[PDB]
């Protein structure tokens, strides 16, 4: 395919090299005549292993060239990848300056082009950027309309500097933000041979995925460092500790714990976080990230409370009370906390939990339930149908499979607040999720 | 084996069921008459799938029993597991109250026994607890010596409530904290049949591993929730976003980013963290964890500075300047930041980086290197041997393979500050790690 790439930096030069190596005819575009001149000499503008060879190969086969003539580039290509910078503004916000300039240029360029052109944003931009910035600018400069006249989509990159070519060749996945199907199909064709999933999503999901990947990488580093600092302070090797953590692919390096939802609770996570951070404090080890967990957690409880109390009714049914489905353990259950908040605010609360109800009859926790939290346990209702019938707002609190039916076919006149993820789709007038 | 278990709660009751089901003679000890009575009836004190059957089986076969008689329990077993509570004190610190009484009880019971007994702590306790609390109390009350007269070890548990039996049967790994070899060997024999690695470390490392696992789990949930909250605010399904994150087993769900070391940097992580948190703030989405990353990161830079300047010399050699080995990219490099801190405080700094040295004269970043940061780049030295010979403190800043030789064969009269992990072992008088 004929392809134009806007921006020949750390990302764009690699893409240019990798695409031309696969047989595409690539025209690199940059405002920097320094970078353009190097590329036309088969020279890498950066230190990146293997890049110079790919650029050399591209010039020799006539499949790679560099230019500042953006109009010609667009006229001579089927698709333009935007790979320009999105640096921070002074205040930390996303600087759209370069994206804006390129969009105007591309719009001017396609104004009289009679073949359908396609624009693909590889640069990392926030959700909303394509709708509110890219499309309007291109549409205003071209006199054409997105979709029918020109294709638009996003295609984030996951390359790491120093291993960019290997990362391109063997990525974890290809992510496509799709508006019109033609562009999505075009991108699928370009990446089709890679051994990784092609994931097509809305533009907004695609961009959120990119940011989430990068912030996750940052969170991982930060976690390893804070733990490392604590380990050193207690006289052990932080690398040894993290090495063992990384041998666990069931809980540590799996998708478990990675579902957006409600606060964590139970008899161990809260106390163990408090104890480790307490010890770190005693040892003069600052730990901003580890020290933020409990506050964030409490914030999530408040968030659920705010969703529940936003409905002009006092009749709340709480589905689940112990900290997890399948256990009766009430210790530091966020659902108990939520229940107590509701009771404190005068709500008419009914609660269903088959595990806790069972525990009132069989088990060693009867005294806790009847004497320690009587204000809450007295609100237990043994019949799920009754909780549903007599409540207006139903809160899906933990993962009991018995709550599935209620979500699949909700009686009329009820509002659901989903803290776990039972909902098949996003928030509607009758059902709202805490993170969807 | 003959095993006694102290504490028949959520963890202990499960261990009692699973050990007796494997053919061991198990004597469960608790101060709660309620729990003991239930065990003796073959009844579960808790709602935990499959547990009651195991307890029934243990009573039927005559392998399981419960008692408050701690002395007799110890006399009639060869190993005691401690599974008592370790709840928070009011201040968030670890409450050692239950472990202290159990240690005294066990200590008095072993005084009454000539044969060698073995004590294994399964309860989650902070690094240092076994050496500073458990051992002294057992020794004091028994008048005997740890390791020599009685076996001592730790064996953290990784069980989740509601899936505890499945987790016992199919754990990610078995972790053993070891003092005397006999106890380590005994624990290995108990867990040999399981399909998972057996990891034997010092007691402190074992204790640290357990905490790190739980705080990691807490961090995972918190990350998912904060991202979810942002996702909902931008009109997207947070679950859809995280589902895609979890499809990446190369960067997201791998060990990459999980090594303790230095601050993250480069042209993308910092700016993307800043942009996402900025947007979250605009959308009134609180995000304590995500909002803590940059501060923790800057703290790590300060930590390195502190180690470097602790040596009473001004001659510093910095090995690595760009943000990663194998690239010349200086954008938001933590090593450049560190260099500037050192220059600002009057240090005699020499810098080695083969990539920046190359880029300074070939490529597209020359003007930045020569005109923007000459106060740093002018300190570049071509010969690694020269930076080494002329400096007193050498800082291992990024992962260049060239630095390996310096670490394995360090010339006399140097102090190494390892920010990466080149050191084979922990901190010594001549070499210190940022997290080891
Ligand atoms: C990812 O990839 C994107 C690029 O990152 P990077 O590290 O490669 O950035 P980089 O700064 O190394 O490269 C960006 C390139 O875009 C070029 N550019 C700016 N405006 C342009 C325009 N009007 N037309 C053509 N080129 C233009 C710049 O000259 C520069 O070479 C970012 O969004 C990042 O988050
Ligand atoms: C892990 O596992 C450990 C136990 O957690 P859990 O959730 O099972 O707690 P849990 O509260 O459910 O069980 C702890 C048990 O230990 C018992 N206990 C307290 N002192 C005792 C003693 N002197 N002798 C015998 N038993 C005693 C309690 O009565 C209780 O049944 C914790 O360290 C946790 O972090
Ligand atoms: N302490 C520590 N730091 C680490 C570790 N692993 C990496 N780092 C650091 O994390 C930073 C970023 O490195 P890396 O992610 O390897 O490279 P890069 O920043 O070029 O790539 C990331 O941004 C890309 C991008 O947005 O363009 C992404 O595409 C890419 O996937 C990465 O997330 C660097 O400061 C690293 O030193 C670790 O285990 N421990
Ligand atoms: N939001 C969200 N919450 C989650 C997710 N997965 C689990 N949770 C929650 O995380 C909390 C802890 O649950 P879990 O770890 O499944 O069970 P438990 O707390 O019994 O076990 C943990 O502590 C044990 C222990 O110390 O005894 C550990 O052994 C064990 O591995 C766990 O870390 C609960 O509040 C859960 O609801 C998720 O994907 N998203
Ligand atoms: O150490 C000698 C003695 O120990 C036994 C068990 O008591 O074996 C243990 O130690 C061996 C050597 O380290 C290990 O290979 C083995 O796994 C462990 O049980 C006896 O086999 C031996 O006589």
């Amino acid at each position: 395919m004929r392809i134009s790439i806007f921006g020949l930096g750390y990302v764009g030069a690699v893409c240019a090299g990798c695409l031309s190596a696969r047989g595409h005819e690539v025209i690199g575009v940059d405002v920097s005549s320094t970078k353009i001149d190097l590329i036309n000499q088969g020279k890498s503008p950066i230190v990146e292993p293997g890049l110079e060879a790919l650029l050399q190969q591209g010039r020799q086969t006539g499949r790679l060239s560099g230019t500042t003539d953006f109009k010609k580039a667009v006229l001579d290509s089927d698709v333009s990848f935007i790979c320009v910078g999105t640096p921070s503004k002074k205040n930390g916000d996303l600087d759209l300056g370069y994206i804006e300039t390129v969009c105007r240029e591309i719009g001017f360029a396609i104004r009289e082009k009679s073949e359908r052109h396609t624009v693909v944003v590889r640069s990392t931009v926030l959700p909303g950027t394509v709708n509110n910035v890219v499309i309007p600018l291109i549409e205003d400069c071209s006199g054409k309309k997105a979709g029918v006249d020109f294709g638009v989509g996003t295609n984030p990159e996951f390359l790491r500097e120093s291993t960019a070519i290997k990362d391109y060749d063997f990525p974890p996945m290809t992510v496509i933000g799709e508006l019109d199907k033609q562009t999505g199909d075009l991108l699928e064709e370009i990446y089709r041979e890679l051994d990784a999933p092609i994931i097509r999503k809305t533009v907004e999901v695609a961009e959120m995925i990119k940011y989430t990947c990068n912030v996750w990488h940052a969170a991982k580093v930060t976690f390893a460092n804070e733990i490392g600092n604590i380990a050193k302070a207690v006289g052990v090797d932080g690398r040894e500790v993290m090495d063992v953590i990384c041998q666990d692919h069931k809980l540590n390096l799996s998708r478990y714990y990675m579902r957006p939802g409600f606060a964590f609770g139970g008899s161990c996570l809260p106390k163990d976080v408090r104890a480790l951070t307490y010890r770190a404090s005693q040892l003069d080890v600052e730990h901003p990230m580890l020290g933020s967990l409990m506050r964030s957690n409490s914030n999530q409880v408040q968030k659920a409370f705010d969703l529940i109390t936003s409905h002009d009714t006092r009749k709340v049914g709480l589905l689940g009370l112990s900290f997890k489905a399948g256990t009766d353990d009430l210790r530091e259950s966020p659902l108990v906390e939520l229940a107590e908040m509701l009771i404190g605010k005068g709500y008419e609360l009914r609660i269903f939990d088959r595990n806790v109800e069972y525990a009132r009859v069989h088990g060693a926790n009867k005294e806790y339930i009847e004497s320690k939290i009587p204000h809450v346990s007295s609100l237990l209702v043994s019949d799920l149908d009754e909780v549903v019938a007599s409540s207006d707002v139903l809160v899906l609190g933990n993962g009991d499979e018995l709550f599935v039916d209620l979500v699949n076919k909700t009686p009329s006149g009820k509002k659901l607040v989903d803290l776990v993820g039972f909902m098949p789709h996003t928030t509607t007038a009758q059902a709202e999720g805490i993170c969807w």
Side-chain angles (χ1 to χ4, degrees), chain A residues 1-59 61-70 73-89 91-107 109-111 113-144 146-165 167-180 182-311 313 315-366 368-371 373-400 402-436:
Chain A
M1 169 160 2
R2 299 172 163 171
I3 301 177
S4 44
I5 295 169
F6 284 72
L8 301 177
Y10 284 84
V11 170
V14 169
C15 291
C18 293
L19 285 163
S20 62
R22 290 161 165 74
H24 295 288
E25 289 170 15
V26 176
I27 314 173
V29 184
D30 208 298
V31 295
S32 173
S33 168
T34 298
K35 295 180 188 190
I36 293 315
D37 291 353
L38 280 168
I39 306 270
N40 286 327
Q41 292 164 34
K43 235 92 264 179
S44 175
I46 62 178
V47 173
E48 178 68 59
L51 188 52
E52 196 151 285
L54 288 197
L55 301 172
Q56 289 175 349
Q57 289 161 28
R59 290 296 289 145
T61 64
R63 287 195 247 110
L64 175 66
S65 68
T67 189
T68 64
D69 195 340
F70 60 84
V74 164
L75 279 299
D76 296 354
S77 59
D78 284 353
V79 57
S80 291
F81 285 101
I82 298 173
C83 295
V84 183
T86 48
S88 295
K89 282 164 36 161
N91 68 359
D93 201 11
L94 173 73
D95 188 344
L96 264 8
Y98 300 113
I99 294 287
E100 287 166 358
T101 296
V102 167
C103 292
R104 292 191 275 258
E105 289 177 357
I106 288 167
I110 73 158
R111 177 172 266 171
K113 195 185 180 196
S114 54
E115 216 186 324
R116 163 194 198 74
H117 197 75
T118 299
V119 183
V120 178
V121 188
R122 307 266 294 183
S123 301
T124 294
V125 295
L126 286 162
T129 302
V130 170
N131 285 333
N132 301 301
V133 175
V134 174
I135 289 184
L137 287 175
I138 299 183
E139 284 188 341
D140 162 295
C141 293
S142 65
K144 264 114 170 216
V148 90
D149 295 331
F150 62 90
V152 179
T154 69
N155 174 216
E157 54 79 28
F158 304 107
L159 311 173
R160 296 169 297 170
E161 295 181 12
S162 83
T163 58
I165 294 172
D167 286 346
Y168 188 105
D169 290 350
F170 301 104
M173 57 181 85
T174 295
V175 173
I176 293 162
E178 180 175 344
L179 257 2
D180 57 282
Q182 299 102 292
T183 298
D185 286 356
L186 186 148
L187 288 166
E188 188 165 279
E189 225 350 89
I190 285 170
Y191 295 119
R192 188 190 295 287
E193 245 153 271
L194 306 179
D195 185 17
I198 292 167
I199 300 172
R200 293 167 71 156
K201 298 298 192 177
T202 62
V203 162
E204 292 88 357
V205 164
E207 295 317 308
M208 195 66 195
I209 285 169
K210 178 52 182 168
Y211 276 95
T212 297
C213 285
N214 270 6
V215 184
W216 179 232
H217 303 171
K220 294 179 87 187
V221 171
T222 301
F223 179 88
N225 292 345
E226 291 199 6
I227 289 294
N229 291 343
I230 295 166
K232 180 178 166 80
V234 307
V236 304
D237 191 329
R239 304 167 300 177
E240 181 169 5
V241 171
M242 291 305 300
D243 279 350
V244 174
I245 265 49
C246 290
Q247 289 184 252
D248 167 14
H249 291 260
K250 291 191 184 180
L251 299 182
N252 290 345
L253 296 182
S254 70
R255 78 170 337 294
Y256 196 78
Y257 302 112
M258 298 288 276
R259 297 171 71 182
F262 204 39
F264 62 82
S267 46
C268 294
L269 295 200
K271 76 176 185 73
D272 295 350
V273 172
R274 288 191 296 262
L276 190 66
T277 55
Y278 194 92
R279 186 59 181 158
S281 289
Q282 285 188 314
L283 292 176
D284 306 318
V285 178
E286 299 180 72
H287 50 281
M289 183 188 156
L290 300 186
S292 76
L293 304 180
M294 300 309 302
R295 181 51 63 200
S296 185
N297 205 55
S298 291
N299 284 178
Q300 202 70 173
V301 177
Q302 185 67 54
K303 194 168 195 272
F305 179 89
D306 295 348
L307 289 185
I308 297 162
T309 57
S310 67
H311 297 297
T313 178
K315 298 183 182 178
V316 178
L318 178 61
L319 305 190
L321 187 64
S322 64
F323 86 114
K324 287 172 65 178
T327 175
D328 69 314
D329 198 354
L330 293 150
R331 290 174 297 168
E332 295 197 69
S333 174
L335 300 174
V336 170
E337 184 171 355
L338 183 61
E340 295 180 329
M341 292 174 66
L342 291 170
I343 296 168
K345 289 277 181 183
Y347 286 80
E348 186 179 305
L349 189 58
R350 291 175 172 79
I351 307 171
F352 180 88
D353 191 303
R354 46 170 173 163
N355 304 304
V356 179
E357 194 86 47
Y358 187 81
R360 287 213 291 198
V361 188
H362 307 98
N365 293 329
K366 296 175 185 180
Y368 186 76
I369 300 162
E370 306 291 332
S371 165
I373 60 165
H375 51 305
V376 179
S377 64
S378 75
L379 309 178
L380 252 13
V381 175
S382 64
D383 179 302
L384 177 57
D385 291 335
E386 173 55 24
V387 177
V388 171
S390 293
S391 305
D392 294 332
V393 172
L394 294 160
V395 181
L396 302 166
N398 68 32
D400 197 317
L402 284 174
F403 308 155
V404 176
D405 181 58
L406 169 63
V407 179
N408 288 353
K409 39 208 60 157
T410 313
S412 53
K414 276 127 188 23
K415 301 279 184 90
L416 305 176
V417 178
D418 185 8
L419 308 185
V420 33
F422 285 100
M423 289 162 63
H425 296 295
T426 47
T427 287
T428 63
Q430 41 264 340
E432 72 193 317
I434 185 161
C435 297
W436 49 93

